């Protein structure tokens, strides 16, 4: 729109940063919530340029979902019309799109299996009793 208000921008934006939270020995913490409150700060008393609010705002629309690739387009639009204003921040943001990557290979199918995720074979029989 013409401005978007910090309160429904820093919620979905906390929660997304939470997700990361999860694995905090990838430095995710200090990190994005040091910017996260930065964030905040400079939205209200920064008093941020409108054009950076409102697409900013498109992040949060798609920051809902697993739109990590999406969420690099604004940044890509940010660094050509007003980067030096948001070249903060945005260094944590951008990380947790980098490291967002990395918990789609986190599976989850480890729920009492008893034959791996498809089937599993022993080339070891335990015992050289038929060898």
């Given at each position: ?14 929660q997304?940063?939470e ?42 629309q ?29 260094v ?37 009793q038929?060898?």
């Open positions: 729109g013409s401005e978007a208000v910090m309160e429904d921008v820093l919620r979905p934006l906390e997304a940063l997700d990361c939270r999860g694995h905090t020995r990838k430095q995710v913490c200090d990190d994005i919530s040091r910017r996260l409150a930065l964030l905040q700060e400079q939205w209200a008393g920064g008093k941020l340029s409108i054009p950076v609010k409102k697409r900013m705002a498109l992040l949060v798609e920051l809902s979902s697993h739109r990590w690739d999406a969420a690099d387009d604004i940044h890509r639009s940010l660094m050509v019309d007003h980067v030096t204003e948001v070249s903060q921040w945005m944590g943001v951008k990380r947790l799109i980098a490291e967002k990557r990395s918990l789609f290979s986190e599976e989850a199918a480890n729920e009492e299996k008893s034959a791996a995720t498809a089937e599993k074979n022993h080339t070891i029989p335990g015992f050289q038929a060898s």
